[PDB]
Curated annotation (Swiss-Prot), chain A:
Protein name: Spike protein S1
Known function: Attaches the virion to the cell membrane by interacting with host receptor, initiating the infection.
High-level lineage: Viruses, Riboviria, Orthornavirae, Pisuviricota, Pisoniviricetes
The gene coding this protein: S
């Protein structure tokens, strides 16, 4: 629950931009919370992560 | 003292975000009450040791 | 030409390990928490030293 790509389409919204540097709410593909994003480089992700 | 925020104390989760995104208000309260009792017990013991 | 066929098999079960992750996210080290007494000390301290 609250992660994946089997998403219900009852409550519809539009894809916003990842606003870095502000205290934002987020629903990233089911993952929800409040936070502050920061753009970074990252070599640790494979194609399955 | 910080590691006490990740115990369940017999609830379904240690996270208050995971409980309030899965259960209705009458049944989320029963789970929240267990976390509240555990965390108050841990704060009480810390203050006695200080 | 002096070659051999090898297929080593061992059973599996559900159990707790302590795993070690480096700066690339690769599993470098592992310890079965119930195999010996040193492994009990390692899983009780959550430490490989």
């Amino acid at each position: 629950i609250n992660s994946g790509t089997t998403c219900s389409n009852d409550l519809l919204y539009s894809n916003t931009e990842v606003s870095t540097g502000v205290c934002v709410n987020y629903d990233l593909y089911g993952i929800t919370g409040q936070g502050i994003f920061k753009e970074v480089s990252a070599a640790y992700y494979n194609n399955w992560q | 003292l910080l590691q006490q925020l990740f115990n369940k104390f017999g609830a379904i989760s240690s996270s208050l975000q995971e409980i309030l995104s899965r259960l209705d208000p009458p049944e989320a309260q029963v789970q929240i009450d267990r976390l509240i009792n555990g965390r108050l017990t841990a704060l009480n013991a810390y203050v006695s040791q200080q | 030409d002096n070659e051999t066929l090898e297929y080593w098999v061992t059973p599996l079960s559900r159990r707790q390990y302590l795993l070690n992750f480096d700066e690339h996210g690769v599993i470098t080290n592992a310890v079965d928490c119930s195999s010996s007494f040193l492994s009990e000390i390692q899983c009780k301290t959550q430490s490989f030293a």
